[PDB]
Structure formats: C-alpha cells, structure tokens
Design an enzyme around this catalytic site. Structure first.
Site, PDB file in Angstrom:
ATOM      1  N   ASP A 128       0.785  -1.243   0.000  1.00 32.35           N
ATOM      2  CA  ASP A 128       0.000   0.000   0.000  1.00 32.35           C
ATOM      3  C   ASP A 128       0.816   1.292   0.000  1.00 32.35           C
ATOM      4  O   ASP A 128       1.382   1.683   1.027  1.00 32.35           O
ATOM      5  CB  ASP A 128      -0.936  -0.023   1.228  1.00 32.35           C
ATOM      6  CG  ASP A 128      -1.814   1.221   1.345  1.00 32.35           C
ATOM      7  OD1 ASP A 128      -2.031   1.926   0.334  1.00 32.35           O
ATOM      8  OD2 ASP A 128      -2.306   1.479   2.465  1.00 32.35           O
TER       9      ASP A 128
ATOM     10  N   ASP B  52      -1.962   5.696  -4.992  1.00 32.47           N
ATOM     11  CA  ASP B  52      -2.245   4.765  -3.896  1.00 32.47           C
ATOM     12  C   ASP B  52      -2.603   3.338  -4.311  1.00 32.47           C
ATOM     13  O   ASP B  52      -3.725   3.057  -4.724  1.00 32.47           O
ATOM     14  CB  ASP B  52      -3.380   5.412  -3.075  1.00 32.47           C
ATOM     15  CG  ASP B  52      -3.881   4.553  -1.937  1.00 32.47           C
ATOM     16  OD1 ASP B  52      -3.308   3.479  -1.667  1.00 32.47           O
ATOM     17  OD2 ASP B  52      -4.871   4.981  -1.307  1.00 32.47           O
TER      18      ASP B  52
HETATM   19  C1  LIG Z   1      -3.805   5.274   6.631  1.00 33.01           C
HETATM   20  C2  LIG Z   1      -4.091   6.775   6.529  1.00 33.01           C
HETATM   21  C3  LIG Z   1      -2.783   7.527   6.199  1.00 33.01           C
HETATM   22  C4  LIG Z   1      -5.094   7.078   5.452  1.00 33.01           C
HETATM   23  C5  LIG Z   1      -6.315   7.653   5.840  1.00 33.01           C
HETATM   24  C6  LIG Z   1      -7.262   7.969   4.856  1.00 33.01           C
HETATM   25  C7  LIG Z   1      -7.015   7.709   3.485  1.00 33.01           C
HETATM   26  C8  LIG Z   1      -5.786   7.135   3.101  1.00 33.01           C
HETATM   27  C9  LIG Z   1      -5.490   6.873   1.584  1.00 33.01           C
HETATM   28  N1  LIG Z   1      -5.084   5.464   1.291  1.00 33.01           N
HETATM   29  C10 LIG Z   1      -6.117   4.475   1.721  1.00 33.01           C
HETATM   30  C11 LIG Z   1      -5.539   3.045   1.792  1.00 33.01           C
HETATM   31  O1  LIG Z   1      -4.431   3.014   2.694  1.00 33.01           O
HETATM   32  C12 LIG Z   1      -6.595   1.994   2.221  1.00 33.01           C
HETATM   33  C13 LIG Z   1      -5.889   0.620   2.321  1.00 33.01           C
HETATM   34  C14 LIG Z   1      -6.935  -0.530   2.597  1.00 33.01           C
HETATM   35  C15 LIG Z   1      -7.803  -0.206   3.898  1.00 33.01           C
HETATM   36  C16 LIG Z   1      -6.095  -1.803   2.807  1.00 33.01           C
HETATM   37  C17 LIG Z   1      -6.941  -3.101   2.921  1.00 33.01           C
HETATM   38  C18 LIG Z   1      -7.844  -3.377   1.708  1.00 33.01           C
HETATM   39  C19 LIG Z   1      -7.022  -3.449   0.400  1.00 33.01           C
HETATM   40  C20 LIG Z   1      -7.875  -4.117  -0.732  1.00 33.01           C
HETATM   41  C21 LIG Z   1      -9.284  -3.467  -0.890  1.00 33.01           C
HETATM   42  C22 LIG Z   1      -9.139  -1.931  -1.197  1.00 33.01           C
HETATM   43  C23 LIG Z   1     -10.548  -1.204  -1.283  1.00 33.01           C
HETATM   44  C24 LIG Z   1     -10.260   0.310  -1.145  1.00 33.01           C
HETATM   45  O2  LIG Z   1     -10.141   0.973  -2.174  1.00 33.01           O
HETATM   46  N2  LIG Z   1     -10.151   0.873   0.116  1.00 33.01           N
HETATM   47  C25 LIG Z   1     -10.395   0.049   1.332  1.00 33.01           C
HETATM   48  C26 LIG Z   1      -9.824   2.283   0.215  1.00 33.01           C
HETATM   49  C27 LIG Z   1     -11.097   3.176   0.432  1.00 33.01           C
HETATM   50  C28 LIG Z   1      -8.828   2.459   1.321  1.00 33.01           C
HETATM   51  O3  LIG Z   1      -9.122   3.150   2.275  1.00 33.01           O
HETATM   52  N3  LIG Z   1      -7.634   1.831   1.189  1.00 33.01           N
HETATM   53  C29 LIG Z   1      -4.834   6.808   4.087  1.00 33.01           C
END
Ligand SMILES: CC(C)c1cccc(CNC[C@@H](O)[C@@H]2C[C@H](C)CCCCCCCCC(=O)N(C)[C@@H](C)C(=O)N2)c1
Length: 377
Positions: free
Chosen positions: A35, A220
């Site tokens: 990630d 991302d």
């Molecule tokens: C961790 C902190 C720095 C943070 C807060 C808010 C946004 C972000 C931006 N990056 C988000 C990312 O880290 C975060 C990682 C996931 C929970 C990891 C587990 C599931 C991966 C496979 C399904 C993905 C479905 C999806 O698109 N999701 C699950 C988005 C929606 C999401 O959220 N992804 C980071």
C-alpha cells in the site's frame, strides 16, 4: 539482480496486491498487502474469521514489545493493535533482514477480506502519515537506513487472478516499454502529485485545475478505484454516460454498487471513453499524460450466478479527500516511486492493457502554463 523480484506480487481483483514476507525468529511467513497510500507496517496478530494465519509474537525470540498502542482509520476500514519490533525479510526481494516497527493487529473492522490470502499491510508512504505519529519509522525508511538498498522502488501491477512485481531498490528495464515520464512528489507524506489537465476522449473537462487536486492528489496502490473530488466526479460521470448513452445502466452501476454484465466476449468497449490525466512534469511549463482505457476503470468481477457473461463494476468513485489514483489506474503502467529524487515515474508496462483499436499510453512532452496554480493550498 531484480529478476528475483519479478512476479513477486499476487492478488485478486478488488482485493489488492500482496507480497510474501517473514517476521521474527524463527521466520513466520505472511502475505502482506502493498500500500503506497499509508505508512504503517501491520499484521494480523490475533485470531480472526478471515485470517488463514497470523503473527505469533510469543514464538519469536527477536520480538520486542514497544509497550504502546496504535490504531489506523483508513477511508474504509480500520484496525487497532500493539506496537513492537522484529526482524523482517522479503523472500522474493532484497537479500537482507532488518529490524522494523510492526503493529500487531488485535482488533479490526472491515479491514481483512474473506478469503483474500493476505494477513497484513505494508504502508510504503512517508513518516508524516504514520500512526500514532511521525516518530514511528515506516518499513521502507528502516530498510534504506539499515542496508545498502537504494531509496526507491517500482510497482508493476498487472490486471487479468492478478499478479505483478515490486522491484525493491531500483528499476527493472524489462518490465516496461518506451520512456519513463516523471512527475514531482509535491510533499513527502502521501505520494502526492499534481494533475494539471483532464480529458475524456480528447475533450478537455475545462475545470479550474485546482479542482483536480482538491484537497490533494495521490498515487495509492491500497485503493482499488480512481477516486475523484465531488465536482470532478460529476463532470466525468456525466461525460462517460453521454459517451455510452447507446446502452442502459442502472443508476446503482454509476455509484459502484450494482454490476453490469454482457454475453461473454460482447463487452462494448468502444462505447466507453479513454481518460487522459496530465501530470506536472520535470521542466518549466512541461507536463505529460497517461491515458486510461475502459478496461481499467470497468473492473471485472466474478459472476455471482452463472459464469456465462462478463460482468464489471464501475471503478471510478466520488471522494471527499482529494483524487486517488488507485490500483486500476496503476495497472498496465510501470510506476517508479523515486524517493531519492522526489519524483514518481510512469511508463507503459510490459503487461499493459489491451484493446482492439486503442492503447494505454504515457505521452510527452506537453506545454502547460501556470501548473503551480493547480496545487491546492
Ligand atoms: C492510513 C491513513 C494515512 C489514510 C487515511 C485515509 C485515506 C488514506 C489513503 N489510502 C487508503 C488506503 O491506505 C486503504 C488501504 C486498505 C484499507 C487496505 C486493505 C484493503 C485493500 C484491498 C481493498 C481496497 C478497497 C479500497 O479501495 N479501500 C479500502 C480504500 C477506500 C482504502 O481506504 N484503502 C490513508
């Protein structure tokens, strides 16, 4: 010797890409989600319905409790646990071992996925967004600090169930064709970039370029979809609907809820437009574009019923926290996270997405005035 890292990633559509790792002594094997949108290294460390296995601290002679808790709330999903350190290695990666921070996940909510095959997550972004705070050194920073591994990595995420490569410490030239085009990392927290123009089937969306980066734009691998700020999302969907207005889709389809199917092999790809995202370049008034095909933003999903038709989900959704160039955008491109030079590079991947009369591309140079004004402050 990057050949040892080629094809070191596996995954399932919509469930991310993971790499194999080992933690502790003796080595415990776990599949970890890759990630670039977060900065915490964490692994399931307690039983959970969807976990085939987990990290057992009591069985590791090198485990060190940091006596401190941690929790991470993502856009969707979150977990909480206990901080500590241990020895970590990547079998299909650099031939080194390093002591890194590790969050043992004790409780989670909508984080782990039923039958995904991964049991943890490797946040590859910077310390600034690490939890509980930026004093918890991210895995990649420890790796670079403790070894001679160069400060950069590249990701070759491939579509169709899925696979790819994470080249740690460099760029493997056999994984891409044409030239690598670079965009500056605006600030080192998320891998933040600046989008200076957007076109759909060659038509300028004609929005204030600041709208494209409100409140930020990031690369991302942990997010599935291309996520766009409300205003941009509306304009884009409106344009995509018009382009494909010769067919009928449930409103739930455009919201990423309902899926659409077609007779196996009859998907009308031609009615869906290509999306061009222009990124700020390396020299004055210069940008470049990456073109996204519908085969990228129409994610294939397993036919819940009778596998007789090709079914897909609209992989573009609305965001309230800026643009997110997720996995479907990275697929087909070779992406270099050049931390050492504060830039992110894009090139057509060896596993690029196919189309009869169209092709994904990374093209430049383009002239674009006042790109600095595109960044949101
Ligand atoms: C961790 C902190 C720095 C943070 C807060 C808010 C946004 C972000 C931006 N990056 C988000 C990312 O880290 C975060 C990682 C996931 C929970 C990891 C587990 C599931 C991966 C496979 C399904 C993905 C479905 C999806 O698109 N999701 C699950 C988005 C929606 C999401 O959220 N992804 C980071």
């Amino acid at each position: 010797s990057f050949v040892e890292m080629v094809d070191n990633l596996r995954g399932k559509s919509g469930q991310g890409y993971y790499v194999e790792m080992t933690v502790g002594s003796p080595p415990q094997t776990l599949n970890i989600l890759v990630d670039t949108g977060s900065s915490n290294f964490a692994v399931g460390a307690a039983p959970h319905p969807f976990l085939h296995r987990y990290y057992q601290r009591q069985l590791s002679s090198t485990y060190r409790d940091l006596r401190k808790g941690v929790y991470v709330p993502y856009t969707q999903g979150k977990w909480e646990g206990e901080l500590g350190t241990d020895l970590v290695s990547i079998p299909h990666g650099p031939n080194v071992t390093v002591r890194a921070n590790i969050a043992a996940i004790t409780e989670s909510d909508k984080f782990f996925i039923n039958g995904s095959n991964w049991e943890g997550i490797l946040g590859l972004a910077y310390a600034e967004i690490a939890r509980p705070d930026d004093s918890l050194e991210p895995f990649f920073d420890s790796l670079v600090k403790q070894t001679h591994v160069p400060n950069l990595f590249s990701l070759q995420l491939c579509g169709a169930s899925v696979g790819g490569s994470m080249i740690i410490g460099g760029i493997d030239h056999s994984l891409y064709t044409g030239s690598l085009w670079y965009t500056p990392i605006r600030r080192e927290w998320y891998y933040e970039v600046i989008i200076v123009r957007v076109e759909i089937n060659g038509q300028d969306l004609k929005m204030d370029c600041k709208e494209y980066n409100y409140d930020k734009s990031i690369v991302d691998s942990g997010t599935t979809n291309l996520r766009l700020p409300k205003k941009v999302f509306e304009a884009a969907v409106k344009s995509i609907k018009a382009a494909s207005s010769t067919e009928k889709f449930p409103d739930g389809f455009w919201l990423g809820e309902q899926l659409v199917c077609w007779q196996a092999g009859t998907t009308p790809w031609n009615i869906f437009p290509v999306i061009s995202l222009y990124l700020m370049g390396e020299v004055t008034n210069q940008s470049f574009r990456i073109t996204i095909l519908p085969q990228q933003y129409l994610r294939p999903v397993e036919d819940v019923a009778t596998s007789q038709d090709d079914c897909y989900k609209f992989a573009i959704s609305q965001s309230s926290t800026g643009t997110v160039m997720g996995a479907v955008i990275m697929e087909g491109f070779y992406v270099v996270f050049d931390r050492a030079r504060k830039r992110i590079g894009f090139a057509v991947s060896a596993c690029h997405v196919h189309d009869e009369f169209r092709t994904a591309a990374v093209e430049g140079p383009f002239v674009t005035l006042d790109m600095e004004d595109c960044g949101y402050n």
